[PDB]
Amino acid sequence: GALKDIVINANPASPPLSLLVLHRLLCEHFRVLSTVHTHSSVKSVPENLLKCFGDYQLGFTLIWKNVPKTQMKFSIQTMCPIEGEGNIARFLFSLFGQKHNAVNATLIDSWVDIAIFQLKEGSSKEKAAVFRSMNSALGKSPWLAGNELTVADVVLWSVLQQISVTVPANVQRWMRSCENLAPFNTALKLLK
Amino acid sequence: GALKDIVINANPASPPLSLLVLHRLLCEHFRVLSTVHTHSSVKSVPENLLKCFGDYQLGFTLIWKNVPKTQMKFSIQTMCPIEGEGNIARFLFSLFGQKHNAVNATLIDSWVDIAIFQLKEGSSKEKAAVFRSMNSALGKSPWLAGNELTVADVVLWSVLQQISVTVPANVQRWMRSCENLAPFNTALKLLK
Amino acid sequence: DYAKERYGISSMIQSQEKPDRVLVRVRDLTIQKADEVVWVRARVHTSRAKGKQCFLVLRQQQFNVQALVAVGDHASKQMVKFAANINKESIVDVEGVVRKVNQKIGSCTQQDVELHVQKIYVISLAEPRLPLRLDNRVIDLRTSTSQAVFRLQSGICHLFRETLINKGFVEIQTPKIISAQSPQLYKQMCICADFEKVFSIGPVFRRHLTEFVGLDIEMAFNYHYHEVMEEIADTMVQIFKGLQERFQTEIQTVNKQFPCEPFKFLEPTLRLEYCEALAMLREAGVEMGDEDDLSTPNEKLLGHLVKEKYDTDFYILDKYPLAVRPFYTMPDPRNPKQSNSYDMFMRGEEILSGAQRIHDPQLLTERALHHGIDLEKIKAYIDSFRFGAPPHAGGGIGLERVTMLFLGLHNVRQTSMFPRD
Amino acid sequence: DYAKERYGISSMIQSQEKPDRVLVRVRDLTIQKADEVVWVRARVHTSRAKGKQCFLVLRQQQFNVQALVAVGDHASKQMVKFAANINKESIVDVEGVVRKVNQKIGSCTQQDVELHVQKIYVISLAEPRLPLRLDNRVIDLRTSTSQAVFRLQSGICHLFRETLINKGFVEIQTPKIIAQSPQLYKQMCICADFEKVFSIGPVFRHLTEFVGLDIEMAFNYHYHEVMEEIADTMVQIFKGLQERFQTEIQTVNKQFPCEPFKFLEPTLRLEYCEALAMLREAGVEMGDEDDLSTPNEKLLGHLVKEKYDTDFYILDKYPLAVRPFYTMPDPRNPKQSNSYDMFMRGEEILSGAQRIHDPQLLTERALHHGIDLEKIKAYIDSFRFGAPPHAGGGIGLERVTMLFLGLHNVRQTSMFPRD
Amino acid sequence: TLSLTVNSGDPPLGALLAVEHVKDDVSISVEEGKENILHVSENVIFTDVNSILRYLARVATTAGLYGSNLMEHTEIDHWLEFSATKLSSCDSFTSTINELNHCLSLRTYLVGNSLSLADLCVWATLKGNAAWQEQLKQKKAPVHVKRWFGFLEAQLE
Amino acid sequence: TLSLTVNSGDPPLGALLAVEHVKDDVSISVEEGKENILHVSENVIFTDVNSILRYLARVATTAGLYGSNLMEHTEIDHWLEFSATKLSSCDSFTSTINELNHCLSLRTYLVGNSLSLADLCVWATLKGNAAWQEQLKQKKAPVHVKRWFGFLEAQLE
Ligand SMILES: [Zn+2]
């Protein structure tokens, strides 16, 4: 992009913790000029969210806005505006370039879809089912991908932290494993 | 007076009830264009006092003001400004013209001096002494002058209503006798 | 005729009587005030009559209610006759009864109720026809649009002052005639005279001679000229926040005739530096030089590009090229081809053109010679800064132009109350 | 020299740095802020120096503090030398320590403390001289008097608006050159359903120009509805200045002694007949229909001050003959009008009246005054369609400021007077 | 028929001056005792100094010491209170005397171009005041008061 | 060794179109069952329609259905979610279709001037939508979408 700036329009009623974690991760790779703004649409955005971050390579402009789906506008003269905090999360993480085979990459993308739709906006029924698939997966591998940390882990953890079911043993170890990492704790503290 | 207006500067910390009674009496004799004002000196005059009065012959301009002694400015181009709520009271009542002999007139003026100085700003000692002289006087005559109601009665009653000591029998009858009159009750109710 | 007392052309109001009468505003005629005997002073907007009934539209400052004069227990036939015979725009005192309507009156602002008339007096008799040239403008300013535009414009001026005054500013009065020029000189003299923060609402002048109203700011800062720029920005933000909170009625009244999306802005006002803007225009396919000034069409485009990305009608363009700005513009200490200047845009049209002023007499004189000015005729201005001249910046906005671009109107004349043809 | 870092002529502020620095205002240097390391940007009012020590008077917007550059644990000899060598009115950044004084500094506004200097940088070097031109007026407006006068004048304009706007008024912008007077435009706004309008802008009356605050208000039945409003607005201005701007009043009082401005809450109103009786009783041969001569206005004010003790009163029911054509005649006495003047310290500030909203009567009175209807056809035509009853009045901002502070010449309250 | 007993320890100066001006009208005698008492009848006595002054001026009809109308009558009542309080004390005397000066700017006598109780009661108290006699010696006494005091000292011997 | 079982009751139109474009690259078979399952390995299966589409485009390297960079890669992810939600429902379809119209104003294909999963997943869902077919008959379908739909219907049939 000639704009060189990642614009992200997000609704403050449902803060995209998935993107705030990935932002901290992005800054640990590149020189990021991060800025927070409040759109005319929303009034009286919570204090914590306004200063949630506290030349350069990339711009990261987070605009708190009254939108139905979290939107990213990057290099509009070459790229259609991206909708869905899941789709934006994949893009941000993919900037580090941890290339995976076809089976893993698809399974990682599958894990994002689960977290965003089924787990987040689901009954105690579906939540319980998601925990089993995670518990079984985390029983075999250290992460949900197992090679190393992936977007799948970031987004899913972020969704779990932003919602009354019994939590299994492997998920508890994976939760502290995530929370132990610098980008996860920094982002979560500035939300709480 | 070519001014045709009785200006009375009074302190709202000590409302001159003696003058408010005499005002009601003045209106019952003459056509009086009565008006209430608040001087720059005083700030936040009590609500009741601001509307204490609920061509023409006389003007009666009551100005609530930060003055030490209640002052009257009438026909300044012929008359020195009058100081003392006692001296102003004598003038207002004297407009009806109930002419008295030298002995009574002096005794009436003597009764005003007593009320204003000795009774108002006095200890329980002097108050008790004033009641005796009144009790003895009111024992012989219906009023303090005894012939008819006089300024002496108006001012003294007004002073007693704006202050502990045992009250005698004659004073209680004289108090209700005064309170029963239209100008005394009307003025006292609008003070509270 | 039995209602002969209840109507007529009442005697010219030469302040004869002080009647115990409460003339309730039309906006206050809601469902809450139903089945009440109320007095109303309004104009007759339109008066349709058929036989036994006469309906009037009683209008007052961009608000109107449906009034009804019915023959029966209240009015006579000659009263209904007189009611329809009242010429258009005549002002009338009306004693009526507010009665709840079975269905909404979509035409009127007071949809919840109608006014059952008992008395109608014409206090001001309008002559029959209506013109379509001073009296022209008088009628034009009664239109719900004009009323809403200029009541909102009054709002801008108030929000402008209230904002600056609360942040510790002092209003000055520039003379504006000298024996007629621009007011910047006087603001800068005030800055040089220990008046730290000054603003001035007054008429300004620009193959024609043009007069318009300008709201001007001049502010002494500590170390960076952004201290002023970020203040001017917040002040324009506070104006927008203010209009969208209080003046929502007036915005919709203009919207109804001139459709326009709500004005959009960011709380920390968006800032693009000149280099960033050139990259956006060149990516958008615009052959432009590094030191060239933004052409009026490019300003229009750049605004659209900003709206496309950030979705804000209000942004700041910073670090302009020094060559294109006036002499008194402080050069950038690092890149002496760039300046410490800025423009602010509403819907992609320039409203403000501010910068840091040169408070050093010598450099101010050098830049004056660079622009080829006779120092003799600006000797007075330069001499002002020789004794304790603090660092300061500023900027001015066209009140009419701001009102126009906020409501998204086309021609400036729409937001000018008394335009001179 | 070891303090060569701590002083000097710092580079011209071309917005190079964004320093983590808090330049505290001089007024905030009180006893409460004692024994604190503070930064101050002020001007050098006067700098007296004797041997080892150099004292400065650091001034900022009609406030000043005593600053001290002492050789020892803090400063060097060349720094004290440089401190005294700083030319008058030069602006300086000062890093000092607020220390409590053993005795009050009666000369300064900050009497409770002095500033023990640690650093002094000249950010703006004033040239040595001070003139006594344009640059003349720049220095003159730094005087604690001027500062106080014009900061208070800004107050009047704010109190004027805040008052009227809160009462439901709408600010208009009269076109100042086409160059004549603004009344016409206010009346057209009234005729255009703008119920309550005011305009702060330059007015004219050799050509003289001054700033006028103008009101025009449509009333119900009586023109007193407007008069009593205009009065309350002027009262609210006075109440406002005496509450908030007490610092600015005393600053002008210190140089120009004047008793506090006195007024009554329901503003005093005398009708014209009453005023003639007071003047005739005071020994003034005057006619029933004559206009108050400027000296009589001065006298009448003194007579009002003598009786009621108010510097602000209203003179009502003026003679019709002396007022302009558009003045509504009194319905009972057609020799009298529905006009009024308002006086501050016995000098006229306002000259208002009820306007003629009937086109016919407005034309009759125009012929009575011998006006060519042709050249005022436009104005008359404005009222032909739904013209409501309305009155108004205007005040001279400079004149109000002058008579409130009890100053002699108007030039004192005019920021940029044109010789 | 009329008798006055005066405090010999502190004579009522104004009362005596009044008594001297009513000798022509009504027969009055002077005894010397321990307090100020005007014996009018067996039932009628007056302790207060002002009460005594008021009676004498009222009963002395031809003297005309209580003015020529209710307005002058009231002016006098003011000056009796003025003398009894503001002059009787030397507290903020610098203010008190300047008020009396202003009042005497265009007046020859205090009330109605003739000798009134006002003139007597004020002059008496003013003579008896310490700070007054100090202002005269130091020549810081106001113009109009001095001229008035000098004129009464001449008429009162 | 790739096998896909499809819901015969409701065929995944976009998946089949994808399968037809990967036949050249990797050997894949079509069975008919009760639900959509892509059998890759004994351990590797996918239930979600998008998961199936994503895998096929990734494994079909020469096809290039997942774009030519991370930017085009992300654009496609957007359109998969777009098709799965906003087109899958006919709620406020008037808005949805106008967004897709705007996006196709200066685009021939949805991503990068070549056939992408975006083109397939959207077209498939759009064909399967009712309100779309109604807009076409009533001729109230936007210009750019119609031309794009007509162009893909030609290439896909
Ligand atoms: Zn304001």
Side-chain angles (χ1 to χ4, degrees), chain C residues 206-220:
Chain C
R206 254 179 196 168
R207 297 177 179 182
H208 300 295
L209 315 171
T210 172
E211 179 205 322
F212 76 100
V213 172
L215 325 187
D216 272 280
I217 297 170
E218 208 69 47
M219 177 177 178

Side-chain angles (χ1 to χ4, degrees), chain B residues 119 123-134 165-166 168:
Chain B
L119 177 54
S123 55
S124 291
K125 301 192 184 179
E126 300 154 40
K127 288 178 183 175
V130 168
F131 279 118
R132 283 186 183 183
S133 303
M134 287 175 73
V165 190
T166 55

Side-chain angles (χ1 to χ4, degrees), chain C residues 41 43 59 175 222-223 388, chain D residues 41 43 93 193 209 220 386:
Chain C
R41 181 175 290 185
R43 301 175 116 89
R59 181 190 45 98
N222 297 354
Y223 294 104
Chain D
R41 181 176 288 186
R43 300 166 165 275
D93 294 6
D193 302 13
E209 178 206 320
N220 297 354

Side-chain angles (χ1 to χ4, degrees), chain C residues 97-109:
Chain C
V97 177
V98 179
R99 288 174 178 190
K100 179 187 171 73
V101 300
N102 301 306
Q103 290 181 348
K104 293 288 182 182
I105 311 170
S107 49
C108 283
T109 55

